[PDB]
Structures are given as structure tokens and as C-alpha cells.
Amino acid sequence: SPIFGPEEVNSVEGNSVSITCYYPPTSVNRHTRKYWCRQGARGGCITLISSEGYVSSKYAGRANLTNFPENGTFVVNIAQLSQDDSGRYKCGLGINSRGLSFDVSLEVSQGPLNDTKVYTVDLGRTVTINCPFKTENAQKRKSLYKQIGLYPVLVIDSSGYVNPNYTGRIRLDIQGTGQLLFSVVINQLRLSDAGQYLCQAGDDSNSNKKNADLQVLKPEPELVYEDLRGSVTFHCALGPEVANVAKFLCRQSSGENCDVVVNTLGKRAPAFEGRILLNPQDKDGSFSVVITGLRKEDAGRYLCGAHSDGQLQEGSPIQAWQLFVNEESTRSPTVVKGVAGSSVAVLCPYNRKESKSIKYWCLWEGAQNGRCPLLVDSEGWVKAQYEGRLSLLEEPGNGTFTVILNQLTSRDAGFYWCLTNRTTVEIKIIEGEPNLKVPGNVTAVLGETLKVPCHFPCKFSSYEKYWCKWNNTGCQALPSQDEGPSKAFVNCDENSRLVSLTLNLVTRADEGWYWCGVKQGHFYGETAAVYVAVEERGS
Ligand SMILES: *[C@@H]1O[C@H](CO[C@@H]2O[C@@H](C)[C@@H](O)[C@@H](O)[C@@H]2O)[C@@H](O)[C@H](O)[C@H]1NC(C)=O
Ligand SMILES: *[C@@H]1O[C@H](CO)[C@@H](O)[C@H](O)[C@H]1NC(C)=O
Ligand SMILES: *[C@@H]1O[C@H](CO)[C@@H](O)[C@H](O)[C@H]1NC(C)=O
Ligand SMILES: *[C@@H]1O[C@H](CO)[C@@H](O)[C@H](O)[C@H]1NC(C)=O
């Protein structure tokens, strides 16, 4: 609510754009996470760029985000715009999922148009297109067109025409109290409904027009991992808004067909006789389906959906899972201990032939849950919550890669998978303290030089020592200056060390995460992380 920005933004393929977002310049908000993210299925919003150093590969070289804590604003710059950039976005503070954000529309045309808003909506759901007009057209014909074949085709008229493909699921809502707009409400959106729409009031040269870019999204499959002859539970959570529409669970085919495993109209596929359970539905309209005695053949894409006949159809809301059924092989989870405020360096083995495959590190949640939600991969992705504290390195290589997680707490205790295209790791948090020693709340000042200490015990004297800035593609090493020993340790004086990171002329882009760390050839170890902030006056 408190966040402001441009609600409509229009551009041309090739140009560039500068979106400015305003926020309350509270103490917290000054260096809190700024994010620019794109709206996706099911309310999701995918980080495209953040103030923590994360930059989507889709924005690599193409975009930047500059904070202005004095103004109370930050500015997202995007260049080399493509039509692919047309969409709905949020600019915000904190984490994408939380509230503090503002909703931005971005449209990109091929050459030079008009007032254009983007709508982004899930399959099967409703959209409301608002169509504004001037008083001189308030009692003339209201229309909605769709560009079908570079031809505007009438979808609905105030004269009573409704296009055959929309009948029964479209209405033209005339506002009361003399407001100067009408709305078109479209239900049960289909993939085919996506496209370019034209709102029109009047039929004159005096006509009032608005462009609407309607996007209709398929859902993202949730991944589920289960063992042969084990069970799985699908929690189907469509709206309360469809709680009274018949539900189905079905399995996707090589074809476009999606054959029903279970129904609320009596269908229960023979393959699943005696091992399928359709549980009752919530007051939320959500329900679950349980499958036992899994066969390898049971693995695939599953949709649960709502449609009056109990079958998958166009314009039906849906939810997706990808199921994996794997053999029970012959092993216990390798265990790694770390201590709060410090770090781990977990070695993940992969099969040497799968060397250029993608590696994954994810949090495993137990066989019934079935899900192992990703935290980081080898392609520059990182979960938002883990920006500045998590990386996946290809070193040492040749059958092994490293996951570095730091800024530890008790919360991080749990089971993790190393994945490729496998290895379970239990992280335990024990009483102890970090060997490396770093300041917490560090603040440089614009144009001035800053230097930042890191203390290394004697333990690490023959280790290689580094400073680097953290981004999501990799921690980049910096000029550090080896300085004299340090007295911050016990049973240590001469062998210990202090290594300093020096930032000679601080720019606004020097803000973000810096890691102090330790290394032995290609085998990485402990790290310590410090956030460098940037203001401009002095203190
Ligand atoms: C926000 O500030 C940006 C950078 O500037 C600071 O404030 C202005 C008023 C000047 O004194 C400048 O020298 C300072 O470093 C500007 O580039 C931007 O236009 C400003 N915009 C808003 C809305 O505050
Ligand atoms: C924003 O990106 C452009 C390239 O499109 C780059 O030249 C510019 O320096 C960037 N902004 C900042 C503040 O570095
Ligand atoms: C349904 O409408 C679309 C345009 O939205 C059109 O292209 C398509 O051919 C129509 N299909 C049928 C079966 O009428
Ligand atoms: C991120 O790391 C890459 C090296 O992989 C480097 O080229 C790039 O400049 C870094 N990004 C920033 C914003 O420093």
C-alpha cells in the first residue's frame, strides 16, 4: 500500500525504460531489500532484480537497480526491451511474497501505442477490463474488440452482440453514479483468450479507445518425489470461488488428452482401483487425493482442476504436479555441523559424465510431503530469502561441486538434497562460534574510501584468504590487502591474520554483500558475510 510507482508504462522494442518507485524513507526501509519482480501463475512474483545483488540472466547486462534513500525512491532501468518484456510487474520492499509493493504494467510494442494496460490472469479465472471514456461519449455504443488475424473482431457490444466463443461467460458492466468507464468481465479464461483487446466508447472520430494486453497463464508444476509402492498426496487448492464446481484429478498424456484418475461424479480409473482416495473438500474448497502402491508407470504430469462435467476442458482452472517414482536403492545421509553466524561448505557428488548438467541444492521435506523446494542452482537462480548467503560453485569439479551457505541460524537445521540430471545431507547446528570474524552493520559513504577487516585464526594461516562481492552468478574476488597478524583469538598470536577489503572510491553500486572467506586450492571452506551500505552526507 505505502509503495508508489508508475501504474502504466509503454515502450517500443529496442528502447529502454526507467521505472521509479517511491517508498516511506523509514530507517528500516533505507537499505531493506528492494525488488523488481514479474507476476506469474497463482499469485507468484519472480524476482528479476534486487538490491542484494541478484540479477536474473534475463536481465544480465540489460538492467540495473539504483537506490536513493534520501529521496525515498529507487529506480529500475531496463534496456533492449523486447515484446517478451510485456507483462505485469511489482516493485517493492522486503520479500516479493510479503505485502510491501506496487503494481506496474509494462507494455512493449514492435514499432510505435496508446494507453495500454496489461492483465495477467490464471487459466480458468476471471478478468475485469476497465474501459474509460469521456462525457461526450458516455451514451454512445460501448464495445470490446479482439485483434484476430490483424482484424479487430467484436467480442461484446452494448447493442447486445456477444461473440459466439464468449457467450455465457462475459458481461458488460455499466458503472452507476455517472462514473466515466464501463467494465467487461470475462470468466473461465482460456489460453485462446489471450491477446490484444480494444476498449471503445462511441463510434465517431470522437471515439474513446483503450488497449488491453490479456495474458492467461498455465500453472507451474510442483515437483514430487516418491518411492515405488509408497504413496502420494495431492493437495488440490483451487478457489473457494469454485468450491461448488465438480473437481477432477487427471494424468497428462503424450496427446493433448488428460485422462481422469478421479472425479466427484463417480469416475475412478481402473489402473487405480483399490489404491485411490478422494478426500472431502474444505470450507476453502480445497481437497486432497491420496494414491497408494505407486507403480513406475504412475509417474508423470498430474492436473487437478474444476469443471462442471468432471473433465479437463478449455477455460478450466487447474493446478499441476510432476511425480517421480524411484526405486529403493540398497545409505544414510551425510551429516554436516555448523554454528550460528558461521557457515558450511557442503560437497555434492555428481556422476562425472553428467558434468555439464545442471546442479541443484534444495531443502528436502520428507517422503509424505514429497517436495524438495529449490534454494539454489548452477544457472544463477537463488531463492529470494537466500540472497547474499548462498552459492553453488563448480569447484572442486570432476564429480563434485560445492554449496556454500553462511549467516547460519538454528532455522537452517534440516535435510537437503544435492541434485543433478541423488545425495541427502543433514545440516545440524551445534554450540560454537565462527572462526572468521567480521563486522555486522557496515556503512560506507559515497565517493569516500572504505576498508573492512576480516580476522583469520592460526587454523587458517596456510589457507588462501579472499574477499569477494556476492552476486547470484558467483562471488567475485576483490583487491584485498594482507595486513599484520591479529589478536582476536586464543592460543593464537603470530600465526593468525587480518585481511582487509579496500573500496577505493565508493559508488552507489558498491552496496550489497561482501564475503570474507578461506580456501585450499579448489576446495573452499568457511566464509563470513557483511553487508556494505551506502549513504552520502557523513557520520
Ligand atoms: C533523486 O536523486 C537522484 C540523485 O541525487 C541527489 O539529490 C538531487 C536532488 C541532487 O542534489 C543530486 O546531486 C543528489 O545526489 C537524482 O538523479 C534524481 O533525479 C532524484 N529524483 C527524485 C524524484 O528525488
Ligand atoms: C544502467 O544500464 C546502462 C546500460 O543499459 C548502463 O550504461 C548504466 O551505467 C546503468 N546504470 C548505472 C547506474 O550504472
Ligand atoms: C474461438 O475464438 C477464437 C478467437 O478468440 C477463434 O480464433 C477460434 O477459431 C474460435 N473457435 C471456435 C471453435 O469457434
Ligand atoms: C557477477 O559476477 C560476474 C562473474 O561471473 C561478473 O562478471 C559480474 O560483473 C558480477 N556482477 C556484478 C554486478 O558485479
XYZ file of C-alpha atoms and ligand atoms in Angstrom:
605
model
C 0.000 0.000 0.000
C 2.681 2.539 1.028
C 4.674 1.904 -2.178
C 4.119 4.116 -5.235
C 5.228 3.816 -8.855
C 4.041 4.106 -12.460
C 0.905 2.049 -12.957
C 1.059 2.110 -16.790
C 4.328 2.063 -18.784
C 4.621 1.766 -22.572
C 7.678 1.391 -24.830
C 8.995 0.105 -28.099
C 11.115 -2.948 -28.918
C 14.692 -1.717 -28.663
C 14.184 1.338 -26.440
C 14.908 1.453 -22.743
C 12.915 2.420 -19.666
C 13.337 3.831 -16.182
C 10.736 2.848 -13.573
C 10.771 4.925 -10.401
C 9.310 3.605 -7.182
C 8.751 5.679 -4.040
C 8.734 4.303 -0.518
C 8.485 5.683 3.049
C 12.111 6.551 3.892
C 11.976 4.845 7.345
C 15.231 3.748 8.936
C 14.411 0.125 8.069
C 13.377 0.953 4.517
C 16.603 2.744 3.693
C 18.619 -0.372 2.882
C 15.902 -3.015 3.117
C 15.693 -5.316 0.111
C 14.412 -3.524 -2.982
C 12.964 -5.866 -5.610
C 11.682 -5.826 -9.123
C 9.734 -8.930 -9.962
C 7.419 -10.314 -12.636
C 3.909 -11.601 -11.902
C 3.301 -15.244 -12.619
C 0.776 -18.016 -12.020
C -1.021 -18.406 -8.686
C -0.001 -15.019 -7.280
C 3.680 -15.740 -7.702
C 6.089 -12.926 -8.397
C 9.546 -13.867 -9.684
C 12.482 -11.684 -8.757
C 14.116 -10.168 -11.824
C 16.422 -7.838 -9.972
C 17.103 -6.917 -6.321
C 19.250 -4.589 -4.260
C 21.048 -7.595 -2.763
C 22.996 -8.314 -5.944
C 20.591 -10.727 -7.635
C 20.148 -10.185 -11.348
C 18.141 -12.637 -13.458
C 20.040 -13.973 -16.501
C 17.185 -12.465 -18.481
C 18.356 -9.044 -17.245
C 22.118 -9.745 -17.402
C 23.834 -6.734 -18.981
C 20.451 -5.263 -19.676
C 19.224 -3.705 -16.453
C 20.240 -2.090 -13.159
C 18.614 -1.029 -9.897
C 19.753 2.166 -8.113
C 18.563 3.113 -4.626
C 18.042 6.715 -3.443
C 17.400 6.551 0.358
C 17.405 10.351 0.714
C 14.630 10.837 -1.884
C 12.857 7.724 -0.599
C 12.949 6.192 -4.053
C 14.617 3.601 -6.203
C 14.936 3.302 -9.920
C 14.834 0.264 -12.108
C 16.430 0.696 -15.542
C 15.744 -1.778 -18.311
C 17.181 -1.657 -21.820
C 16.975 -3.627 -25.050
C 13.314 -4.188 -24.391
C 11.579 -6.999 -26.229
C 7.878 -7.860 -26.535
C 8.782 -10.654 -24.194
C 9.075 -7.926 -21.566
C 5.399 -7.028 -21.875
C 3.819 -8.061 -18.611
C 2.776 -7.214 -15.113
C 5.452 -6.409 -12.510
C 5.789 -5.479 -8.872
C 8.331 -3.108 -7.414
C 8.695 -3.455 -3.691
C 10.416 -3.672 -0.346
C 11.290 -6.784 1.612
C 10.365 -10.140 0.102
C 8.207 -10.486 -3.004
C 5.683 -12.678 -1.216
C 5.002 -10.137 1.554
C 2.798 -7.102 1.051
C 5.006 -4.067 0.513
C 4.867 -3.446 -3.211
C 3.391 -1.513 -6.078
C 1.813 -2.998 -9.178
C 3.311 -1.906 -12.522
C 2.143 -2.592 -16.062
C 4.749 -2.750 -18.796
C 3.838 -2.975 -22.494
C 6.398 -3.200 -25.359
C 5.213 -2.658 -28.988
C 7.068 -3.665 -32.230
C 7.225 -0.124 -33.569
C 5.244 2.914 -32.433
C 0.728 2.552 -28.711
C -1.976 4.389 -26.761
C -2.968 3.974 -23.139
C -2.288 0.266 -22.630
C -2.699 -1.884 -19.557
C -1.559 -5.472 -19.194
C -3.695 -8.059 -17.422
C -2.174 -11.270 -16.193
C -4.558 -13.927 -15.022
C -4.539 -17.694 -14.397
C -6.357 -20.190 -16.593
C -9.998 -20.636 -15.661
C -10.177 -17.351 -13.767
C -11.878 -14.006 -14.272
C -10.632 -10.716 -15.661
C -12.176 -7.270 -15.408
C -11.214 -4.886 -18.183
C -11.984 -1.296 -17.335
C -12.828 0.856 -20.343
C -12.722 4.620 -19.716
C -14.484 7.237 -21.888
C -15.227 10.979 -21.935
C -18.599 12.584 -21.207
C -19.259 13.284 -24.894
C -19.282 9.510 -25.493
C -20.993 8.438 -22.274
C -24.270 7.468 -24.031
C -22.826 6.093 -27.267
C -22.117 2.417 -28.020
C -19.708 0.615 -25.698
C -17.575 -2.125 -27.345
C -14.767 -4.610 -26.808
C -12.740 -5.905 -29.758
C -10.033 -8.555 -30.055
C -7.295 -8.457 -32.717
C -7.911 -11.711 -34.524
C -5.811 -12.030 -37.657
C -4.827 -8.351 -37.635
C -8.545 -7.668 -37.783
C -10.496 -6.206 -34.871
C -13.310 -8.638 -34.099
C -16.255 -7.670 -31.914
C -16.374 -9.559 -28.645
C -19.234 -7.704 -26.934
C -21.466 -4.667 -27.662
C -23.833 -2.513 -25.638
C -26.250 -3.301 -28.521
C -26.454 -6.936 -27.378
C -24.000 -8.746 -29.722
C -21.869 -11.295 -27.976
C -19.196 -13.183 -29.904
C -20.016 -16.961 -30.048
C -16.780 -18.009 -28.315
C -17.632 -15.890 -25.239
C -21.390 -16.376 -24.689
C -22.339 -17.188 -21.083
C -19.016 -16.051 -19.609
C -18.872 -12.390 -20.490
C -20.775 -9.338 -19.287
C -20.552 -5.669 -19.960
C -20.945 -3.871 -16.602
C -22.105 -0.263 -16.824
C -20.995 1.659 -13.710
C -23.515 3.579 -11.647
C -23.139 7.088 -10.223
C -22.108 8.562 -13.594
C -18.531 7.277 -13.445
C -16.870 7.576 -16.819
C -15.993 3.984 -17.588
C -17.578 0.634 -18.245
C -16.171 -2.759 -17.432
C -16.044 -6.044 -19.271
C -15.922 -9.073 -17.069
C -14.753 -12.326 -18.637
C -14.987 -15.679 -16.830
C -13.366 -19.075 -17.253
C -10.423 -17.666 -19.179
C -8.954 -19.908 -21.837
C -5.433 -19.874 -23.245
C -7.010 -18.900 -26.518
C -8.446 -15.753 -24.886
C -5.015 -14.178 -24.620
C -4.213 -11.318 -26.935
C -4.773 -7.724 -27.846
C -8.143 -6.185 -26.918
C -9.595 -2.812 -27.774
C -11.999 -0.962 -25.492
C -14.131 1.542 -27.287
C -16.699 4.135 -26.368
C -18.570 5.795 -29.204
C -18.179 5.124 -32.910
C -17.148 8.599 -34.053
C -13.785 10.093 -34.921
C -14.534 11.394 -31.417
C -14.212 7.783 -30.159
C -12.539 6.830 -26.824
C -10.144 3.884 -27.034
C -8.008 1.812 -24.718
C -5.674 -1.076 -25.459
C -5.624 -4.133 -23.212
C -2.996 -6.890 -23.422
C -4.509 -10.007 -21.925
C -2.177 -12.758 -20.735
C -3.536 -16.094 -19.494
C -1.120 -18.319 -17.630
C -0.701 -22.065 -17.315
C 0.283 -23.220 -13.813
C 3.827 -24.261 -12.778
C 4.106 -27.952 -11.878
C 5.002 -28.695 -8.289
C 7.709 -31.413 -8.218
C 7.059 -34.503 -6.153
C 9.443 -37.281 -5.320
C 8.124 -40.628 -4.133
C 9.298 -44.227 -3.837
C 7.883 -47.230 -5.692
C 4.921 -48.772 -3.793
C 4.878 -45.765 -1.485
C 2.062 -43.218 -1.512
C 1.465 -39.619 -2.589
C -0.964 -36.930 -1.531
C -2.032 -34.160 -3.892
C -3.480 -31.142 -2.074
C -5.777 -29.524 -4.618
C -6.358 -25.888 -3.682
C -8.476 -24.105 -6.254
C -10.637 -21.228 -5.071
C -13.493 -21.123 -2.631
C -14.881 -19.438 -5.697
C -15.161 -22.848 -7.414
C -15.942 -24.945 -4.331
C -19.214 -25.988 -5.986
C -17.822 -26.947 -9.379
C -17.026 -30.628 -9.933
C -13.381 -31.463 -9.396
C -11.059 -33.850 -11.223
C -7.617 -35.377 -10.859
C -6.212 -36.438 -14.205
C -2.954 -37.577 -15.812
C -1.491 -35.844 -18.844
C -0.751 -37.865 -21.943
C 1.618 -37.737 -24.866
C -1.502 -36.388 -26.553
C -3.468 -33.309 -25.532
C -5.790 -35.616 -23.610
C -5.782 -35.598 -19.822
C -7.385 -38.826 -18.612
C -9.269 -38.695 -15.283
C -7.839 -40.642 -12.362
C -10.650 -39.422 -10.050
C -13.875 -37.413 -10.067
C -16.587 -36.003 -7.909
C -19.039 -37.518 -10.500
C -18.039 -41.149 -9.881
C -15.149 -41.785 -12.293
C -12.269 -43.779 -10.892
C -9.775 -45.075 -13.456
C -9.192 -48.899 -13.459
C -5.408 -48.553 -13.028
C -6.099 -47.021 -9.621
C -8.795 -49.421 -8.384
C -8.220 -50.197 -4.717
C -5.469 -47.608 -4.170
C -7.013 -44.150 -4.799
C -8.698 -41.972 -2.190
C -10.619 -38.775 -2.859
C -10.893 -36.889 0.445
C -13.665 -34.398 1.208
C -13.376 -30.698 0.443
C -12.614 -27.751 2.816
C -14.690 -24.703 3.548
C -11.874 -23.204 1.457
C -12.956 -25.502 -1.364
C -9.585 -27.236 -1.150
C -9.338 -31.044 -1.087
C -6.719 -33.805 -1.262
C -6.229 -37.045 -3.201
C -4.215 -39.986 -1.919
C -2.588 -42.624 -4.094
C -1.004 -45.707 -2.614
C 1.095 -48.539 -4.003
C 2.827 -46.461 -6.639
C 3.872 -48.073 -9.883
C 6.699 -46.704 -12.051
C 4.051 -46.179 -14.723
C 2.239 -43.804 -12.267
C 4.877 -41.096 -12.721
C 4.060 -38.116 -14.901
C 2.214 -34.819 -15.078
C -0.937 -34.592 -12.999
C -3.517 -31.851 -13.098
C -6.240 -31.260 -10.609
C -8.967 -28.994 -11.892
C -12.540 -27.709 -11.751
C -15.104 -28.133 -14.481
C -18.835 -28.906 -14.372
C -18.553 -32.233 -16.205
C -15.616 -33.576 -14.168
C -13.312 -33.493 -17.196
C -10.491 -31.192 -18.254
C -11.719 -28.592 -20.710
C -10.687 -25.217 -22.033
C -11.215 -22.399 -19.563
C -10.972 -24.752 -16.634
C -8.900 -23.687 -13.587
C -6.098 -26.111 -12.820
C -3.133 -26.990 -10.673
C -0.137 -29.167 -11.680
C 2.329 -31.666 -10.257
C 5.197 -33.667 -11.718
C 5.525 -37.029 -9.984
C 8.661 -39.160 -9.768
C 8.549 -42.789 -8.665
C 12.007 -44.124 -7.777
C 13.479 -47.500 -6.752
C 14.546 -48.009 -3.151
C 18.307 -48.372 -3.536
C 20.091 -50.733 -1.161
C 22.543 -45.461 2.537
C 22.462 -42.906 5.372
C 22.500 -39.090 4.999
C 25.936 -37.477 5.243
C 25.936 -35.071 8.201
C 27.406 -31.577 8.389
C 27.672 -29.473 11.538
C 27.826 -25.676 11.555
C 27.388 -22.954 14.180
C 25.196 -19.849 14.227
C 26.625 -16.811 12.446
C 29.110 -19.022 10.556
C 28.897 -21.311 7.538
C 29.120 -24.706 5.869
C 30.795 -25.843 2.702
C 28.893 -28.932 1.570
C 30.381 -31.195 -1.055
C 27.882 -32.553 -3.554
C 28.971 -35.519 -5.657
C 27.589 -35.988 -9.146
C 28.364 -38.533 -11.822
C 31.426 -37.364 -13.800
C 29.644 -37.906 -17.116
C 26.800 -35.604 -16.024
C 29.418 -32.844 -15.721
C 27.762 -30.046 -17.726
C 24.316 -30.984 -16.419
C 22.583 -28.562 -14.030
C 23.295 -28.990 -10.324
C 20.694 -28.208 -7.646
C 20.688 -27.703 -3.907
C 17.294 -27.998 -2.273
C 15.562 -28.419 1.075
C 14.035 -31.907 1.374
C 10.824 -32.187 3.401
C 10.146 -35.925 3.946
C 8.501 -38.652 1.849
C 4.829 -37.713 2.537
C 5.371 -34.061 1.696
C 7.170 -35.332 -1.408
C 8.516 -31.892 -2.266
C 12.075 -30.611 -2.337
C 11.721 -26.828 -2.936
C 14.816 -25.322 -4.554
C 17.150 -22.877 -2.854
C 19.861 -22.508 -5.498
C 21.079 -23.987 -8.782
C 24.096 -23.738 -11.094
C 22.398 -21.335 -13.515
C 22.192 -18.208 -11.389
C 18.969 -18.847 -9.564
C 18.615 -18.283 -5.836
C 15.522 -18.261 -3.663
C 14.905 -14.673 -2.542
C 15.372 -15.406 1.171
C 18.905 -16.625 0.403
C 20.354 -13.710 -1.495
C 23.813 -12.887 -0.115
C 24.214 -16.083 1.892
C 24.107 -18.972 -0.586
C 26.145 -20.057 -3.610
C 26.765 -23.139 -5.709
C 30.283 -23.491 -7.079
C 31.513 -25.878 -9.774
C 34.663 -26.396 -7.724
C 36.330 -28.671 -6.885
C 34.854 -30.167 -10.051
C 35.294 -33.551 -11.757
C 32.415 -35.274 -9.986
C 31.906 -32.812 -7.158
C 30.517 -29.311 -6.726
C 30.341 -27.108 -3.599
C 27.435 -25.470 -1.816
C 28.358 -22.575 0.430
C 25.730 -21.429 2.922
C 26.606 -18.809 5.548
C 24.958 -16.452 8.054
C 23.723 -19.601 9.788
C 20.985 -19.915 12.425
C 19.079 -22.787 14.086
C 16.401 -22.489 11.404
C 18.772 -23.917 8.774
C 18.850 -27.238 10.603
C 17.366 -29.908 8.335
C 17.651 -32.240 5.338
C 18.912 -31.169 1.955
C 19.409 -32.764 -1.424
C 22.221 -32.432 -3.850
C 20.611 -32.950 -7.302
C 21.770 -33.157 -10.897
C 20.287 -34.563 -14.122
C 20.752 -38.008 -5.523
C 22.625 -37.076 -2.328
C 21.000 -36.336 1.028
C 22.763 -34.077 3.551
C 21.669 -33.343 7.111
C 22.700 -29.998 8.496
C 22.990 -29.704 12.243
C 23.565 -26.519 14.239
C 25.759 -27.044 17.285
C 27.005 -24.782 20.030
C 30.082 -22.957 18.841
C 31.283 -19.747 17.253
C 32.585 -18.584 13.874
C 36.324 -18.844 13.330
C 36.232 -15.907 10.885
C 35.426 -12.533 12.411
C 33.717 -9.675 10.612
C 31.764 -6.504 11.451
C 27.942 -6.703 11.345
C 26.354 -3.407 10.238
C 28.906 -1.747 7.948
C 28.265 1.619 6.248
C 30.484 3.233 3.602
C 29.944 6.805 2.374
C 29.703 7.953 -1.255
C 32.920 8.926 -3.009
C 34.923 8.147 0.140
C 37.222 5.137 0.538
C 36.241 2.355 2.906
C 38.216 -0.541 4.263
C 36.755 -3.584 6.021
C 38.588 -6.012 8.293
C 38.431 -9.766 8.417
C 40.278 -11.748 11.132
C 41.675 -15.228 10.458
C 42.812 -17.516 13.304
C 46.008 -19.552 13.210
C 43.957 -22.504 11.996
C 43.773 -20.740 8.605
C 47.298 -19.345 8.214
C 48.364 -21.723 5.469
C 44.930 -21.378 3.815
C 44.311 -18.927 0.994
C 42.213 -15.954 2.027
C 39.802 -13.974 -0.133
C 37.343 -11.127 -0.196
C 34.562 -11.043 -2.808
C 31.282 -9.380 -3.712
C 28.288 -11.650 -3.856
C 26.018 -11.754 -6.911
C 23.811 -14.691 -7.965
C 26.149 -15.976 -10.725
C 29.131 -16.092 -8.417
C 31.054 -14.386 -5.689
C 33.587 -12.069 -7.469
C 37.021 -11.665 -5.831
C 38.394 -8.215 -4.960
C 41.648 -6.385 -4.215
C 42.234 -7.089 -0.541
C 45.326 -6.069 1.423
C 47.075 -8.543 3.641
C 47.831 -6.737 6.896
C 49.568 -7.690 10.138
C 48.510 -10.529 12.470
C 45.512 -10.154 14.764
C 44.752 -10.574 18.453
C 41.181 -11.742 18.395
C 41.944 -15.409 19.141
C 43.093 -17.748 21.926
C 46.188 -19.969 21.561
C 46.967 -17.662 18.648
C 49.165 -14.625 18.105
C 51.793 -14.876 15.374
C 50.060 -17.300 13.009
C 46.730 -15.503 12.926
C 45.965 -12.778 10.445
C 43.920 -9.750 9.415
C 42.992 -9.251 5.764
C 41.328 -6.083 4.685
C 38.974 -5.354 1.844
C 39.527 -1.889 0.450
C 36.960 0.041 -1.610
C 38.922 2.989 -3.011
C 36.099 5.129 -4.471
C 32.699 4.040 -3.271
C 29.887 4.298 -5.847
C 26.163 3.599 -5.179
C 26.659 0.293 -6.976
C 29.253 -0.769 -4.351
C 26.416 -1.508 -1.956
C 25.492 -5.099 -1.242
C 27.026 -8.300 0.124
C 30.721 -8.876 0.646
C 32.149 -12.198 1.778
C 35.361 -12.834 3.538
C 36.393 -16.460 3.055
C 39.023 -19.169 3.136
C 40.289 -21.671 0.613
C 42.743 -24.513 -0.045
C 43.315 -24.756 -3.772
C 39.959 -25.685 -5.314
C 38.437 -26.821 -2.002
C 36.535 -23.988 -0.338
C 35.840 -23.515 3.347
C 34.456 -21.128 5.893
C 33.054 -17.752 4.911
C 31.777 -14.678 6.717
C 29.427 -12.155 5.243
C 28.978 -8.452 5.723
C 26.570 -6.052 4.085
C 28.069 -2.785 2.891
C 25.555 0.095 2.923
C 25.960 3.470 1.185
C 24.857 6.995 2.239
C 26.304 10.372 1.211
C 26.485 13.096 3.898
C 28.750 11.823 6.649
C 28.592 10.371 10.165
C 16.728 11.653 -6.671
O 18.123 11.868 -6.513
C 18.911 11.448 -7.638
C 20.359 11.660 -7.263
O 20.502 12.662 -6.265
C 20.570 13.563 -5.080
O 19.536 14.535 -4.944
C 19.431 15.527 -6.012
C 18.300 16.484 -5.620
C 20.779 16.227 -6.260
O 21.118 17.017 -5.133
C 21.869 15.166 -6.511
O 23.110 15.835 -6.699
C 21.936 14.221 -5.297
O 22.985 13.265 -5.419
C 18.507 12.228 -8.885
O 19.261 11.774 -10.007
C 17.015 12.056 -9.134
O 16.628 12.860 -10.243
C 16.223 12.444 -7.880
N 14.795 12.248 -8.087
C 13.885 12.309 -7.106
C 12.464 12.087 -7.511
O 14.192 12.530 -5.945
C 22.121 1.093 -16.420
O 22.355 0.310 -17.616
C 23.055 1.029 -18.647
C 23.110 0.119 -19.852
O 21.817 -0.039 -20.418
C 24.431 1.453 -18.136
O 25.130 2.157 -19.157
C 24.259 2.322 -16.900
O 25.529 2.701 -16.376
C 23.450 1.578 -15.829
N 23.233 2.409 -14.671
C 24.146 2.596 -13.708
C 23.743 3.490 -12.580
O 25.254 2.063 -13.758
C -12.935 -19.195 -30.854
O -12.480 -17.791 -30.852
C -11.132 -17.608 -31.306
C -10.772 -16.155 -31.074
O -10.744 -15.817 -29.690
C -11.060 -18.045 -32.766
O -9.782 -17.773 -33.332
C -11.364 -19.536 -32.819
O -11.248 -20.038 -34.145
C -12.768 -19.803 -32.275
N -13.028 -21.238 -32.248
C -14.233 -21.776 -32.474
C -14.308 -23.272 -32.386
O -15.214 -21.092 -32.736
C 28.832 -11.060 -11.188
O 29.927 -11.972 -11.416
C 30.373 -11.970 -12.779
C 31.394 -13.077 -12.911
O 30.765 -14.349 -13.021
C 30.923 -10.593 -13.135
O 31.337 -10.582 -14.497
C 29.849 -9.534 -12.912
O 30.403 -8.240 -13.115
C 29.289 -9.629 -11.490
N 28.195 -8.679 -11.306
C 28.337 -7.504 -10.678
C 27.102 -6.657 -10.587
O 29.408 -7.139 -10.209
